[PDB]
Amino acid sequence: MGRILFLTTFMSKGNKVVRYLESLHHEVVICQEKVHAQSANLQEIDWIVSYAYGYILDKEIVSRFRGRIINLHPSLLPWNKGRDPVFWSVWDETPKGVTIHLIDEHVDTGDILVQEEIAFADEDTLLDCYNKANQAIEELFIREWENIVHGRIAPYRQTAGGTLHFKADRDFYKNLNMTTVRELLALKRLCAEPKRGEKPIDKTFHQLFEQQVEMTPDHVAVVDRGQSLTYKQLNERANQLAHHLRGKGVKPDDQVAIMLDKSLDMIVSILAVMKAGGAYVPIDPDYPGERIAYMLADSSAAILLTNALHEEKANGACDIIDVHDPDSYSENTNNLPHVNRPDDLVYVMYTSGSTGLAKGVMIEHHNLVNFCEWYRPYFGVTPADKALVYSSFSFDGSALDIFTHLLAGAALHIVPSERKYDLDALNDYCNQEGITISYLPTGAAEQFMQMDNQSFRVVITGGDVLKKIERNGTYKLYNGYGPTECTIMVTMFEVDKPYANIPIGKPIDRTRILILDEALALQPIGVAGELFIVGEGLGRGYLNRPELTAEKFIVHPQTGERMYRTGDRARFLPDGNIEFLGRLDNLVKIRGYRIEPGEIEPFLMNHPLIELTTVLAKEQADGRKYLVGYYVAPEEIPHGELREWLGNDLPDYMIPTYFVHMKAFPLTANGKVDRRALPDVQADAELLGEDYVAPTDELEQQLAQVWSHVLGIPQMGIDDHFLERGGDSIKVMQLIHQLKNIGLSLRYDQLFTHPTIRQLKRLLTEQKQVNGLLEPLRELDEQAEYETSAVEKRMYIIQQQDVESIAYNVVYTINFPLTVDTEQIRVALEQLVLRHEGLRSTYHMRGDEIVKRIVPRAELSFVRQTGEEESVQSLLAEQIKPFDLAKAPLLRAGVIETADKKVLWFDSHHILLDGLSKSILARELQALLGQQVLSPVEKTYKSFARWQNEWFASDEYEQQIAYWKTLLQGELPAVQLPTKKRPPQLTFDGAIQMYRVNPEITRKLKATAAKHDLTLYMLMLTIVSIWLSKMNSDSNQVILGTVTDGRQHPDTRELLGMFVNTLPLLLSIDHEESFLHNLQQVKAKLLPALQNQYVPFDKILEAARVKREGNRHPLFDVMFMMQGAPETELESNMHHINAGISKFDLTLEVLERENGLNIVFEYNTHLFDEGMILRMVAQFEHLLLQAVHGLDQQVKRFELVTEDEKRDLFLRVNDTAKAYPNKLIMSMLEDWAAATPDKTALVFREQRVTYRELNERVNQLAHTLREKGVQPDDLVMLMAERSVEMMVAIFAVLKAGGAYLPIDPHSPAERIAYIFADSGAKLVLAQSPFVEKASMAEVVLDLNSASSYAADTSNPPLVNQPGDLVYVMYTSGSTGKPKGVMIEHGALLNVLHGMQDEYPLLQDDAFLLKTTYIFDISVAEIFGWVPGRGKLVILEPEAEKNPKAIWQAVVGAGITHINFVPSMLIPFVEYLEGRTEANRLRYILACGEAMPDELVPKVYEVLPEVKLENIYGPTEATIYASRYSLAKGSQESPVPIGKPLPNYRMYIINRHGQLQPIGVPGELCIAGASLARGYLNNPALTEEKFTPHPLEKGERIYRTGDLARYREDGNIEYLGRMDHQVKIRGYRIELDEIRSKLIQEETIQDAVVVARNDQNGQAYLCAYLLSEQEWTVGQLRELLRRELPEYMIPAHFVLLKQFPLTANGKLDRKALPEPDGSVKAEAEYAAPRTELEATLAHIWGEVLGIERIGIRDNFFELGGDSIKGLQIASRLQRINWTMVINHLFLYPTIEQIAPFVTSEQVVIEAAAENLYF
């Protein structure tokens, strides 16, 4: 050992590494500060270990301790050196790992000692990768420190390469800590500066235009009125005016104004200024004369291009160049020499309408070129297109209309103001001229969608928020976004489907969009922020406004890129698109809620009458703001209708206060809706619309003031709904308490039946006035010990079962800015310690009573630590320690300070801190940190405990107990969630998963509940109940737990203590009714439970007499909680920490945060994993969206399984399509017999039949059957044993045309006469011993008489289609008389081809005919050899029971394929174990019953190289349906029946016909090609079992009646019949688990487990066993009590010798002994009456070794052998007690053999001692 100097700055002082070094008994000196070269901490030091050290050691220290300074770096060096290594490992996509290296004089450039490779997942957050890396570097140290300190590791130098990163290089990506890895990279690809990007722009617009004029010179360029201009004509004319302009003094970057109207000369003038070298300044001729003069002076334009009509509008301010004067055009028509560069200005357009007069935005040539070169290929603009010059030329909308289409050869069409505003005439012009593409502003576009257009193919819109997508046209709709400072637009989106917020799209060419926060840092995907624009669109800036240019056009402080502040809020969507979220200044406060008014307009325009809408947020002089909803409709809409239409999806404050009807929205001269031209409302004096009905009396006024105090709404109306205007459960109790001071009593349920003041008055009329119903809480006097509450006694008892448990520790974290004083927080916390007695309360136990003791003062543990982002969790973890309830304070605090935040953490116990106590602790701490004075407390918790304990003696408490004792009586429901194997003991290890409900859906949830007199909790509880029901196999009742506030006395809502109470909720789900009906039923069961909510949970368990199990929590196993919105801002920034604990199997907590819902899924990690919970979270979201949109839909119509799961099930299971030859099996025989007539086909006994001999004899009987009246789909019955004649009959039946119906010859006459009639058949092909057995039914032939054959040996003609019957197999199933399954040829062919693809029987192979032909399995043996042209070895009749004969057939005939039903394979492998004969066997195909798990190794040990296969299939699916290949080294927990065969499909549905997900059980259904036509002469049963289903799209499915479940692998698991199911209080059980112990018992070879209903009806768990030993009940019970719990412990164990199998080898559950019988059981104890028995008990105790022997104990049960009896009889003989060893077998007990053991009386009278002499 040696001294170690541990250097850490951002890690803990007692890390996992430091304390492991102390376990090895090292002296670990810890120094967190900068160490000097000659310090005391450097003396007598042998090793230096560093872990997150934030300083650089001196160069002397590195050399003085060279080879002795070890560093722990969580990065795979040389990659990611320096600071923040784990983040840069993910962002730069470097290799991942951890490194323990040596320290040199640089940053992480030392020789590596040990290095491991870590793996991060795509769905892991960055914080998750931080913990996973910190653990690896700590585990790597623990694993290798001994090898390091002992020199058993040679340092190897770092390989070449790697990255180096410093501090503050991450400041741009600070918000992305909770972002997944795949989303972090997705943002990188979407926002990182591209390497090479695109080619740099090197052209101006007039350069590219002049090149297009050379390409399409005679194409039509511009069309105005009826005249037209070609590209050459337009080019030459502009060149003429440009020569004049340049000669007049036009230089590059000069600004030439243009004041013309939309005409051909406008296009000429624009191109002329460009060709001259300047930039055109568009001035609308209709502007005010002051606006015109402002632009001319601001632009400093010396030349103005106008005509004579608008000439005087300049007032002689410029050199007027008339566009109609011929002298203004020169004679030179050639292109001018180029004097411009791509950096020169191309146009200047002024924008305004707000702050400032007007600002001149300057755009350059490269800006416009980049847009036009993106516009043409994006929309496919060709010279065949025709565009519309719609927008005013003073705005970039015209730049898109003109410049983009000119560079593609298209034609421009000028729009006069006669059609610019009459959109009906514009649609006429477009349809009659062929206008194919154009840009229309948002307002004009939405009013153009109604017109019937056939000309447009692409219509682009933008400017305002697009909401309308339905249009009367065949054109594609595009939505664009972009400021005027950038070129026209920067993002484009094709509107493909309806959207709530239509995205603005993805950036264009050479353009990148960033979503940044206020600190200019990158926001994660989905997080809102300010939109920034980078790329070639950013112009120069504003004209003569350099301050505003430097304000909006900024270079980024870190990325070093020029960006434009848009002032708009947007977020990135996961698809890569951007969506507009509003302007950063248009956020207004309505009723105390910050809302975006743009979120109201889409719902209002969805009204069937509203076409346009705009919601403004005006204000009054008092300061309050009100929302006004302007709408354009054909006529006015009543105020109540618009209030109701928006009340379906929006809250009350988002419903506008007033609505204004408009006929046409006033547009500005620029295409936008004139917002300041909308009519201001007249009633703007705090008017409450019109639904306001003023209070008419003194009670309605008194109720309106109480409602105003609780809800915070001024002037309430008597018709206002409580829940609709912010009403909550807490606010209902506040209304009740506020009425108690008035004197009126209101119950909690009566508010939901009287939700308005109008109804509340009518209820409070009969209610008495001033009575003082509420009594004040009496403050207890000072005592030594105080009383504890019922919940405090429970929480105490909980913490006592494991005194070191943190399962009830309450840990929260708040992230403060670094500017907050750490000690100021500690002082505020120490003030809260004395303010509340709970923070100074200690709990002890006086005898058997738990009492509380108050302490005057207690010191607070405030641990200040320094940490990094990637270590805050590990630091906080090491602080969560168990609490001693006898010591105060029950709360520990501390602040972890990082380089960017101060993380305050506090850990308390649930005995003190509950839901409301957290809210009060937040408000008081926030006020103390704000230096606000607090009013001292008035009440204490110790006094409420006294008041409540006395209420436990009242009559109302007994009345509430009687509720729970009757509510929870009888058999309660059982919720079997699809969990993993439940551990024997209850486990508390857990994890969480979070699901966010967006604000929009949250608003629709709360508006729905309030509209139907429900709370959000009632609505969520119904969805949770349905969600649990559908997972519990669509049960009708469910059970779950909930949490109430438990604040009984109204004076306790300001105290700090444990008040919450747990309530069981027994709810019912009616799947046949609507979602609204179930909503009322959940409330009808919740309100009576809340009326009895103040009975402690442990008393409720006692009243119900709930039995305690080990695997499940008592009563319920799923918990559902819900908290309200945070009261303060500090509570909203608090974060609840879970220390890997799940108190229940599954816990759901709904938290109202950020105007949305954060739903937590706390689950036990032993029952669920990461994948299972993710499925259930998606299913809850799927049910929530279906329910909120289907209020009136039946609950049965809501599906649980998701579409991604349905596609996953299709591929892994039901993708079995394969093309198979349609050649029938009777033709394949005659085809093979033709090619190979002299090949062996059948082998019976020791005789062989060739293909020709077989086919010829088949033809003779066929020709005989043909003339007998055999046609397709005719039935002929067979009565023959296993022989060659049976095979000839079957094939001759098929060749003749009919189907063969197998009948056992040895079947009773009662059975045949049934099939003889049900089938209606006539011919009976029977053998000689069974000819008269048909009783001459009709025409009976003799298969052994040559008269029944013919002489024609030629193949009969083909007379069968693939849809004709091939055989009819009767079932004789349980609970029913035999039914004839009709199988067709194509159905049989698909299975034979399918089984040949998996187990190919080739020509050199053979099959064994051993299954009785009245079973479908035999058919696979009858025809299984034909496809591969093999052979069939017919076993001797009744030789299927002799494993000797079966094994001889496999050896002698080289059989490769064999069928074996289980329970018949076990006797076969029991014969082959002591065998060694050679075998050609390849496949053992098992079918008929469930395969025992122990049989798989038994088969592979007696037969290596074989392929054991478990196969399942009902008779209605021909032969088989699914298969599963079993391997050697395998131990499957059941025997999965596997996946369906080719062209087979299997579905597992519930009781409502919905596909069940993985793990959830249901009914197995078959579908595909090989389905039976139906049941013979039973169309009723055919409809019940062969039903059409939407899964097969109208095609039939066969309902097997078997219970089954999907597995994560995809193989289906057999769970037994749907009927004959055994449950344990609803929670079911698997009998195979009980049959495990029977196999574990070596002497118990085989045994079965079922049930039997007793005389009264209760089924007892009867087990049937056979073995070589005699047991007892007690011995068999104890052997099961190993791991099998008591709820599965059976009872009657009747001993058997063989199992009652039937003809199919399965043990008849009926034929099992019904009334038990030979159930071995023990007797009582002992009573050695006489000393003889006591002597017998002592001698038995010595020989048998049993220290306690009873007089009624069986000799053999205590270890009685034949050797023991001789010892016992010998010891008795030595004390004169004759015992016969034979009697011990007849009388095996002491008392039974006591009268039979006699004495050896030796008399001892002697010979007459009186002797003489």
Ligand SMILES: *P(=O)(O)OCC(C)(C)[C@@H](O)C(N)=O
């Ligand atoms: P409302 O039923 O929505 O309130 C929710 C509960 C029942 C949790 C609340 O009343 C409470 N803390 O008891």
